[PDB]
Amino acid sequence: TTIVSVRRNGQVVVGGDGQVSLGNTVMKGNARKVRRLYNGKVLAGFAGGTADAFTLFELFERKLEMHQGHLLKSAVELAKDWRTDRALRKLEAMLIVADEKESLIITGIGDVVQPEEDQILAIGSGGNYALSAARALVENTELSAHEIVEKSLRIAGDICVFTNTNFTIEELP
Amino acid sequence: TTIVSVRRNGQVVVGGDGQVSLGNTVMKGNARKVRRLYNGKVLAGFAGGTADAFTLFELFERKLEMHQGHLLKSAVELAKDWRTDRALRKLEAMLIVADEKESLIITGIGDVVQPEEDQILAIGSGGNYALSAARALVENTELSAHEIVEKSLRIAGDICVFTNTNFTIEELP
Amino acid sequence: TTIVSVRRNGQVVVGGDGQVSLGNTVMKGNARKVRRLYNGKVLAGFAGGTADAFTLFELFERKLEMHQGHLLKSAVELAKDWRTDRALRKLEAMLIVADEKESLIITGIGDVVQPEEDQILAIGSGGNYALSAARALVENTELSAHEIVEKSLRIAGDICVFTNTNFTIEELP
Amino acid sequence: TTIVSVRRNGQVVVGGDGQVSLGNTVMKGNARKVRRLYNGKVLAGFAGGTADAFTLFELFERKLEMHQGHLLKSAVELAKDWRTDRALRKLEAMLIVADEKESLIITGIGDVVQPEEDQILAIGSGGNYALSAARALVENTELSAHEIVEKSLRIAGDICVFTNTNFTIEELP
Amino acid sequence: TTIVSVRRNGQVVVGGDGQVSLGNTVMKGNARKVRRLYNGKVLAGFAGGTADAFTLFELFERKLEMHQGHLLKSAVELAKDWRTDRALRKLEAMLIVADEKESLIITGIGDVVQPEEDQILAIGSGGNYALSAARALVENTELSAHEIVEKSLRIAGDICVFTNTNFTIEELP
Amino acid sequence: TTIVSVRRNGQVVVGGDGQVSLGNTVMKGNARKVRRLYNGKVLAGFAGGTADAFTLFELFERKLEMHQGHLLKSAVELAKDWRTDRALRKLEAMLIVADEKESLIITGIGDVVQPEEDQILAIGSGGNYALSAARALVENTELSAHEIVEKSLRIAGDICVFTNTNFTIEELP
Amino acid sequence: TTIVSVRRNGQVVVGGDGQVSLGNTVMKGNARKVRRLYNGKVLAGFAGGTADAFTLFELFERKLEMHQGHLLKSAVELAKDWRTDRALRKLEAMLIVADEKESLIITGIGDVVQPEEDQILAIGSGGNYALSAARALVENTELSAHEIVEKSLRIAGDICVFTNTNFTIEELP
Amino acid sequence: TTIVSVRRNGQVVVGGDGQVSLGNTVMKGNARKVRRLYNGKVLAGFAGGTADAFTLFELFERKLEMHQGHLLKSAVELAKDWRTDRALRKLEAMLIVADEKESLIITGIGDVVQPEEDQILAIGSGGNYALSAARALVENTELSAHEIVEKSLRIAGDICVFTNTNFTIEELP
Amino acid sequence: TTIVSVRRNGQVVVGGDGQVSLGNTVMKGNARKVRRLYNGKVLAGFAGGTADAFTLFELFERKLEMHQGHLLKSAVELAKDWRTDRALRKLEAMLIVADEKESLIITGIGDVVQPEEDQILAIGSGGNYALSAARALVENTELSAHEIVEKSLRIAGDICVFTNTNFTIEELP
Amino acid sequence: TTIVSVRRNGQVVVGGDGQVSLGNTVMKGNARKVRRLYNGKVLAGFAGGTADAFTLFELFERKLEMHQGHLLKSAVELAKDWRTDRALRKLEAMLIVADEKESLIITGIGDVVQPEEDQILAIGSGGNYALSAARALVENTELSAHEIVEKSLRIAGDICVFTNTNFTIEELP
Amino acid sequence: TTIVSVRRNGQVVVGGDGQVSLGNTVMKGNARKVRRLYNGKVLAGFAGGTADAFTLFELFERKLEMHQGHLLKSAVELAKDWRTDRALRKLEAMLIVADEKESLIITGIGDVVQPEEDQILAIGSGGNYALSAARALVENTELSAHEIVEKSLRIAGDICVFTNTNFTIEELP
Ligand SMILES: [K+]
Ligand SMILES: [K+]
Ligand SMILES: [K+]
Ligand SMILES: [K+]
Ligand SMILES: [K+]
Ligand SMILES: [K+]
Ligand SMILES: [K+]
Ligand SMILES: [K+]
Ligand SMILES: [K+]
Ligand SMILES: [K+]
Ligand SMILES: [K+]
């Protein structure tokens, strides 16, 4: 799995591949791993099971609702519950969330990670290949966030056997 | 075990073999791995223990009763319970459910999987062999869902040591 | 890797994918795994390292030369040396060889092996997926051996994470 | 794999199935597990790798050449080498050898086993099922060695997932 | 343990050995593993602890009472409670029950199971040895069900280290 | 640990050693592993922790009280609870109980074991050495139950590194 | 396996059971584990493979020959070679040797063990059960060495699942 | 991670690196692991997730408030809640807190701990490298606490693969 | 470790980081992992021990010498020996070699890998991060091979905890 | 095993227990583990097999002969041969040797070692218990070396399950 | 164990502690881990078995004799033998060697490591603590090589449980 997000010139993009694997075989090649949340104002990408994703995206929306739409505050609150609720502790996954203000990785191990100054985030088994390609592109070209995400996902798809080249890409605004 | 499902021309078929292997021997040879649930409106097949499967089938029917018979919603709700409940987490198996609208694989690891455009799903140790044969037949012949399921189960049976030639094939007219 | 061979209507075809993997990552995606030997009269596919393949193919040619083009006798002697010499025993590659008369699989651990009446052979991690698709196509369509190999390689490349869709296909017309 | 040997009324028969399983799939289905050695005066069957077996069969014939064709002496000498040689210790398998006087199982763990008064020997994952059926038939019917071997192999085949219905049966008239 | 049942010429027999093992040692050699239930009309054999058996047999009787002697319905309900209750789920015993109409195996993990056309059933570590001997005897002799069970138990007791030769055999004449 | 019981000429004795070990060292060498229960009418020996013993002896007394002092009935009831209560399932141990009528071993794995006709029972790591010596003495001498228990515990103490020679022996009446 | 030796009133006996096991099943039930060596002047019992036994008994005879028939000296020399020869180090087993002067256990771990004052030795998985019974008999009866060996082997056979009751007993003189 | 604190000549300093790792890769290199609490009067460093840290620091502030700035009492109560609540017990972070009076380490497993006479404290995988460098510098130079923390963090960052050289250093002048 | 090679506009470059690690700590941070061979006409990078590197670079030079300086031929010959020589088989590592004609990865598992059409190769734990960045740069910028190698090594150094930023870069010509 | 030596007031004593264990059972309880060498002038204790000890002691004598009774030089040469010869390297015994001048421990892995100012040495699994008791007795009582060794062996025999209380004690008056 | 080497102002010092730990206890406390080799012109220290170390030291001196006393060449040659020789591969340890020109670490895993510009090397479980302290002292004081080594060994000793305060420090004037 590869999910990568880039923010450039007032645009933020989150994109992912479509491969769901079981052991060394492919169960599905067109999964949609990126969704729009909170009245389409938040982009969310997940590396993990769909049902697991629904439970966590559901709660994150409840956090946004009670926390005035503050991404960081909502993210920290989600992480706290995910880290301590006996039910949620069974959900193994990683998430990337982004809104018009900032981008974050949320984990189930009590961490919420902000990006470096280049504003790029990536998760999944192939995430670091997209991250490497994205940083190269951001630091050496004028390409748009959308174009970098597309090119980075492709590079990750050609290296990671668990990442394919069937992408789902969401942009905001 | 091999369970395969094909949907074509308004017909939905789910079938499986009959071999139950204990250790590396044939425990039973005429198991019934596909069943009709929800007043005969749902087909369900399982790869795993018979007792475990019956437990999950009953729970799924309760989810269907709860969510107006909507398959995807019910499957996601079952996957969530399966993922967190102490007793259900001890239940090892994979499920295929199908009604007149859609087909899904349900897992105990937080995944609910929809088929690709071919509308085929397969599970079990021999699942991928039936999947390969079914995809070849759907894309290259005019055979019916029933015929493809029978022919795919037979091909899987000649390759997988744990898959039988004694099939139970159920269809939703 | 997936290498598959089909013989139909006087045509024999051997084709393979192009992925070379190290762990769960791809080192090369355009590998040619099928070669023409014995001045074009023999098609040879291999799952394994290129150095191993070069060694085994050069040794195989030598044998074909001294057995005046007899594939089976040449293969039987190859397998004999393979299990005899401590140097060759270190080679883990798997091979498929085919001429206008017959098709065979040769490995260092299982000596020589012939196909069933359908004359399909497959090796590599994705082999059985290709085999399942090929058997379905031979038994249910009038497709040529080339068409079947191309379609079976594709089906396997869509299921096996170690097999890709960049194929090299050779045919003995 | 199932190899079984029965001696009755001056006839000595050794037979086996034809299934070679790679992982948990049918690698090959028509293997020849029983062979005639020593100018056709010895029958030998093996449970394990084909290459490994051929290596041990060749070594056994050299032992027979060395010890005037005496089966027990040669088997003990083979067992000793198999037990200590660096390369042979890597060879995993069990063997059954039989001539017109006696039958023996040879192992790589320092054992040479003679049959009980029933004069029956069996090896392989399905060996004990064939052993049970053969003992029942020798003690309760007047069937010949050949018939008992065929019927015992078939019974083992319905129980052991790794045993085939394609037999090679050799007899010493 | 080895429990085996054969039905022939209007006679049904269930018999078992008497060894109770803890690790690789024998705690008891004269255990009675076959009992007469439902006032003598039902033969029941079990592989497992005596406390577990007492629990399951008392529960089975209750069901036979409310199902007016119907073995299958009683067994199906037994298996339902077995997988339903957390208390019963802890019971790992395996059972064989037989009346003048039919013979069945019941386990906590595989629910209820019926025999093949030969009407032989077996459970316990030595079960398959008894099954192999019994199938050979049914298919090749005119022996009574009692004779076959006695001879099959003996063959299994001579192969399985956890089965002995002190048998308890019950017959429904 | 070694606990052994012999019943001879109207006398029943239960005795045990005094060693409590942790890993390969001795924590205590004078533990009292045999106690008198039910108004001194029942002898009880335990292989396991003291607190574990107290919990189980406590419950067994409650069983005797509600089951009219019937040892077998009380033992089966204790085993059922021990086998299924989530709390009791954590207690790992074995027990021997004896009254003026009979002797029994109670386990936490759903079994209650009665002695062979020689009326000797033994548990603990050294139990089978005392059992061997006891059977030799019972079958070949006229020694009293008390003397055999004492001599058997001593023999076990000289063989098992986890059994010592500091005994606690209770007799009834 | 159980081999036990007792020396009483000028007679020394070595006896063993006949079971050869592979995993949890019996390969042979009438093996002869005790032999007479050195012109019938030495008794030898072995727990291990037959071929392994032949190699070691062969060398021990060579030691006797060059060491004037001195058992202890010959035993220590055999142990030294067994402990250090790369070939012999592969032989896993234990031996008991006895002559008219003394009895010894020889191991492959650089040890030669003399008996306690009771002059009883035992090896094999069931050896300590025969040892316990033998010591009880020697210390409490007037039975002959032969009778004690026979009764001890029987007691071990009823406890150890890897020891049977088919004995081979040799006496000297 | 490496967090280290040194107190010298009325100055207390706490500093840490900025690497956040997941497995053997870096998720972030500019993390701020040292924060100013209690309106600037308390320096706090942490090894662990940011969500965990936010939780523990908010809880610590609350305690400082009710203990009127008493670091030790506040830390002791923090550690009490940490091991008491099942929610907090899931938090694995390690903390270092320091005010103008004293410096302490607090963890969920080891409660509160104070420094040795040199007043150096360190946590994180690289902690002991920083501690070793700091002890050498305190005992052999006149360097300020700030200089020592900066130099010790650098030495640790050059040895530990999970610690980098992007430091955040806070001082209480 | 990260070694990466790019060939662009008649220039070929091989560069690597300087970190040598033992477990999770750094043994050396300025290792030179790229050398010039064959009279400075060949560039060689290695991921593995220095002594191991010297042995293999030494042999590769011997191959060049006897094979007229043909890189591919020399590489295949080195791989064959490395794959089969008992001494060389102990050397675990990966190598990249380049001359004015082509670039290759040589492994000890019988493989020699040529680059894709972009002519980029990379090995080491961080190799795929440099590979991702290099491909992004080659496909989207006009930067020189030297500049891409430098920027790619840097990106890999910021992600892989086992790769640092102390580079050694060689260019040809 | 426990061997301990104490030197006090011109007396040196070496004593050991008598237990020989195989796994968790006792093969012999009256072993003599301390011997007088060099015509009575050297006391030698050993933890290990008797064959190993015979080998090492005969080799040690030879060295004492050529070093005219010099214990240290003889021991240093012994240790040299021990780690030099592939035959001797297989010997795992541990030794303690003492003469009227000094006491030393010699092992195949740690060469020669001398005692601390208290002149106590101990080897064997129970060694450190004897050492702890001996150090307490030397530092706090006026007891003779013989009394201390006897009392320390007893304390160790009461704690270590592999050490018994049948001691052999030798003293150089 | 902690061995550390520092070179400064023409002085080269190698030192180590004296603790040898067997299991988790202090086997010996005054080991001599640093030795002078090659006619006193080379200093060598080891982390690992004493016997193993002495074997490697002897072999190194032979390499020095072979290569005109050149340290690096000799170290690389030793590393090559250590890497491939069957017996030497069983030798677990790390070495530090130093002469008047250079210092190196030699490993059995194909590595020969030179120090960074600080000219410091350290090995052993406590090596990195001594390394940290030595680097702090070399970069921030004017202490001599000898003083830094002693002070670094002491700091390591307060942190590593396996490192002593009894040092052997050798220097090359
Ligand atoms: K991919
Ligand atoms: K099958
Ligand atoms: K693929
Ligand atoms: K089968
Ligand atoms: K048995
Ligand atoms: K004991
Ligand atoms: K037995
Ligand atoms: K670092
Ligand atoms: K790094
Ligand atoms: K003891
Ligand atoms: K220490």
Q: How far apart are alpha carbons B140 and C143 in whole angstroms?
A: 9
Percentage helix, strand, coil, to 5, in chain K?
Answer: 35, 30, 35
* Distances from the Cα of G74 to the Cα of G82, G106, J11, angstroms: 12, 10, 38
* E82 contacts B50? CB cut-off 8 A: no
Angle CA F51–F54–F60, to nearest 5: 145
Structure token pair of residue J35: 């011997």
Burial class (CB in 10 A: 0-12, 13-18, 19+), B117: exposed
CB-based burial, B146-158: b 16+ in 10 Å, e otherwise: bbbbbbbbbbbbb
Contact of F5 with F45, CB cutoff 8 Å: yes
* H125 contacts I26? CB cut-off 8 A: no
Residue of D nearest to E148 (CA): D136
Q: What is the CA radius of gyration of chain A?
A: 15
Q: Does A84 touch chain H (CB under 8 A)?
A: yes
Distance from residue B29's CA to the centre of ligand 2 (Å):
11
For residue D49, which residues of chain C lie inside 8 Å, CB to CB?
Answer: 109-110
Please list, in sequence order, all residues whose beta carbon lies within 8 angstroms of the beta carbon of residue J80, skipping any fewer than 6 positions away.
J111, K54
DSSP-derived 3-state class of residue K89: helix
Q: Shortest Cα distance from J2 to chain F (angstroms)? A: 13
Contact of B163 with B157, CB cutoff 8 Å: yes
Q: How far apart are alpha carbons I149 and I140 in whole angstroms?
A: 14
* Distances from the Cα of B163 to the Cα of A156, B52, B152, C120, G127, angstroms: 37, 19, 12, 21, 45
Q: Please tell me whether the peptide bond between A173 and the residue prior to it is cis, using omega within 30 degrees of 0.
A: yes
Domain range annotation of chain J: 1-173
* Distances from the Cα of D125 to the Cα of C166, D51, D156, angstroms: 40, 19, 9
HSE, side-chain direction, 13 A CA sphere, residue E94: 18
Structure token pair of residue K4: 């550390």
Q: How far apart are alpha carbons F77 and F94 in whole angstroms?
A: 15
Q: What is the CA radius of gyration of chain G?
A: 15
Q: How far apart are alpha carbons G108 and B34 in whole angstroms?
A: 58
Structure token pair of residue D49: 């790798």
* J159 contacts F161? CB cut-off 8 A: no
Distance from residue K27's CA to the centre of ligand 1 (Å):
54
Q: How far apart are alpha carbons D132 and D129 in whole angstroms?
A: 5
Block residue for tokens 């995206």: A57
Phi, psi of A161 (to 5 degrees): -65, -15
Structure token pair of residue A56: 């966590």
* Distances from the Cα of I153 to the Cα of A121, A124, A158, D20, I6, angstroms: 20, 22, 19, 48, 11
CB-based burial, F30-47: b 16+ in 10 Å, e otherwise: ebebbbebbeeebbbbbb
* H29 contacts I158? CB cut-off 8 A: yes
A83, A84, A86, A87 alpha-carbon torsion, rounded to 10°: -50
Distance from residue C113's CA to the centre of ligand 4 (Å):
20
Contact of F83 with F89, CB cutoff 8 Å: yes
Distance from residue J34's CA to the centre of ligand 6 (Å):
22
Q: How far apart are alpha carbons H162 and A42 in whole angstroms?
A: 33
Please tell me what DSSP assigns to residue I160. B
Angle CA D131–D135–D140, to nearest 5: 155
Neighbours of ion ligand 9 (CB under 5 A): I 157
Q: How far apart are alpha carbons A170 and F17 in whole angstroms?
A: 74
Q: What is the CA radius of gyration of chain B?
A: 15
H-only helix segments in chain K = 50-66, 71-84, 127-140, 145-159
DSSP-derived 3-state class of residue E101: coil
HSE, side-chain direction, 13 A CA sphere, residue F48: 20
For residue G55, which residues of chain D lie inside 8 Å, CB to CB?
Answer: 80
Q: How far apart are alpha carbons B140 and C150 in whole angstroms?
A: 13
* Distances from the Cα of F46 to the Cα of E39, F153, I31, angstroms: 38, 14, 64
For residue E31, which residues of chain G lie inside 8 Å, CB to CB?
Answer: none
Contact of C11 with I97, CB cutoff 8 Å: no
Q: How far apart are alpha carbons F36 and D71 in whole angstroms?
A: 65
User: Among F21, F24, F159, whose Cβ lies nearest the Cβ of J26?
Assistant: F159
Q: Position K132: which residue type?
A: S
Q: What is the DSSP string of I8-41?
A: ETTEEEEEE---EEETTEEEES----EEEETTTT
Block residue for tokens 């301590």: A84
Would you tell me the crossing angle of helices K50-66 and J71-84 to the nearest 10 degrees? 80
Please list, in sequence order, all residues whose beta carbon lies within 8 angstroms of the beta carbon of residue A117, skipping any fewer than 6 positions away.
H30
Q: Position D53: which residue type?
A: A
Q: How far apart are alpha carbons F112 and E51 in whole angstroms?
A: 6
Please list, in sequence order, all residues whose beta carbon lies within 8 angstroms of the beta carbon of residue G9, skipping any fewer than 6 positions away.
G144, G145
* D1 catalytically annotated: yes
Nearest to H127 by CA among H53, H33, H60, H42: H33
Structure token pair of residue A60: 């994150």
Please report the number of interchain residue pairs, chain I to chain K, with beta-carbon separation below 8 angstroms: 49
Q: Does K140 touch chain J (CB under 8 A)?
A: no
Q: How far apart are alpha carbons E157 and E154 in whole angstroms?
A: 5
Q: How far apart are alpha carbons D146 and C95 in whole angstroms?
A: 37
Please list, in sequence order, all residues whose beta carbon lies within 8 angstroms of the beta carbon of residue J123, skipping any fewer than 6 positions away.
J1, J3, J45, J47, J94, J95, J96, J105, J107
Number of other CB atoms surrounding residue C81 within 10 Å: 17
Q: Which helix (H) or strand (E) holds C13?
A: strand C11-16
Strand partners, J6: J13, J120
Q: How far apart are alpha carbons A95 and A53 in whole angstroms?
A: 9
Q: Does C72 touch chain A (CB under 8 A)?
A: no
User: Among K76, K84, K128, whose Cβ lies nearest the Cβ of I25?
Assistant: K128
Phi, psi of E166 (to 5 degrees): -105, 95
Please tell me what DSSP assigns to residue E166. -
Q: Which fold has domain K1-173?
A: Glutamine Phosphoribosylpyrophosphate, subunit 1, domain 1 (3.60.20)
CB-based burial, G122-157: b 16+ in 10 Å, e otherwise: bbbbbbbbbbbbbbbbbebeebebbbbbbbbbbbbb
Q: Which of D:92-121 have CB within 8 Å of G? A: 105, 107, 109-117
Distance from residue K126's CA to the centre of ligand 11 (Å):
9
Q: Is C157 a known ligand-binding residue?
A: yes
* G139 contacts F151? CB cut-off 8 A: yes
Q: How far apart are alpha carbons E7 and E101 in whole angstroms?
A: 10
Q: Please tell me whether the peptide bond between D173 and the residue prior to it is cis, using omega within 30 degrees of 0.
A: no
HSE, side-chain direction, 13 A CA sphere, residue A21: 21
Q: Does B89 touch chain E (CB under 8 A)?
A: no
* Distances from the Cα of B83 to the Cα of A84, A87, B111, J163, angstroms: 16, 8, 9, 52
Block residue for tokens 């762990």: C23
Whether C contacts J, i.e. 3 or more CB pairs less than 8 A apart, is no
Nearest to C35 by CA among C81, C83, C77, C3: C3
Please tell me what DSSP assigns to residue K96. E
Quote the strand ranges of chain A, DSSP E.
3-8, 11-16, 20-22, 25-28, 34-37, 42-47, 94-98, 103-107, 112-113, 120-123, 168-172
DSSP-derived 3-state class of residue E135: helix
Q: How far apart are alpha carbons B111 and B128 in whole angstroms?
A: 18
Q: Is G168 a known ligand-binding residue?
A: no
Distance from residue E21's CA to the centre of ligand 5 (Å):
11
Q: How far apart are alpha carbons A162 and A18 in whole angstroms?
A: 10
Q: How far apart are alpha carbons D83 and G55 in whole angstroms?
A: 11
Contact of K148 with K134, CB cutoff 8 Å: yes
Please list, in sequence order, all residues whose beta carbon lies within 8 angstroms of the beta carbon of residue J122, skipping any fewer than 6 positions away.
J2, J3, J4, J5, J96, J128, J130, J131, J134
Mutate to test the interface with C, among D19, D20, D22, D55 (most CBs of C within 10 A): D22
Structure token pair of residue I3: 């070694």
HSE, side-chain direction, 13 A CA sphere, residue G48: 24
Contact of C48 with C94, CB cutoff 8 Å: yes
For residue C128, which residues of chain B lie inside 8 Å, CB to CB?
Answer: 128-129, 132, 159
Whether H contacts A, i.e. 3 or more CB pairs less than 8 A apart, is yes
Contact of G11 with G172, CB cutoff 8 Å: yes
HSE, side-chain direction, 13 A CA sphere, residue E75: 22
Please list, in sequence order, all residues whose beta carbon lies within 8 angstroms of the beta carbon of residue H104, skipping any fewer than 6 positions away.
H71, H72, H75, H96, H97, H98, H112, H113, H114, H115, H121
Contact of E120 with E138, CB cutoff 8 Å: yes
Please write down the long-range contacts of J128-133, taking CB distance under 8 Å and 24 or more positions apart.
Answer: J128/K25, J129/J2, J129/J155, J129/J156, J129/J159, J129/J160, J130/J2, J130/J4, J130/J155, J130/J156, J131/J4
Q: Shortest Cα distance from D105 to chain G (angstroms)? A: 10
Please tell me what DSSP assigns to residue D2. -
Ligand number nearest CA of E162 is 5
In this structure, chain B runs to a length of 173
Q: How far apart are alpha carbons D154 and B168 in whole angstroms?
A: 25
Structure token pair of residue K76: 């690389």
Q: Shortest Cα distance from G131 to chain F (angstroms)? A: 8
Question: What sign has the CA pseudo-torsion B72, B74, B75, B79?
Answer: positive
Q: How far apart are alpha carbons J129 and J114 in whole angstroms?
A: 19
Q: How far apart are alpha carbons J167 and J161 in whole angstroms?
A: 15
Block residue for tokens 């389409």: A40
Q: How far apart are alpha carbons I37 and E169 in whole angstroms?
A: 83
Contact of B20 with B27, CB cutoff 8 Å: yes
Q: What is the DSSP string of C120-155?
A: EEEESTTHHHHHHHHHHHHHH----HHHHHHHHHHH
Q: How far apart are alpha carbons I97 and I88 in whole angstroms?
A: 18
Q: How far apart are alpha carbons E149 and G26 in whole angstroms?
A: 20
Q: Does H22 touch chain I (CB under 8 A)?
A: no
Contact of A151 with A170, CB cutoff 8 Å: no
* G87 contacts D110? CB cut-off 8 A: no
Structure token pair of residue H138: 């305190």
Q: Is F157 a known ligand-binding residue?
A: yes
Q: How far apart are alpha carbons D16 and C166 in whole angstroms?
A: 42
Number of other CB atoms surrounding residue A21 within 10 Å: 17
* Distances from the Cα of E75 to the Cα of B36, E55, E71, angstroms: 21, 14, 6
Q: What is the CA radius of gyration of chain D?
A: 15
Burial class (CB in 10 A: 0-12, 13-18, 19+), D142: exposed
Method underlying the structure: X-ray
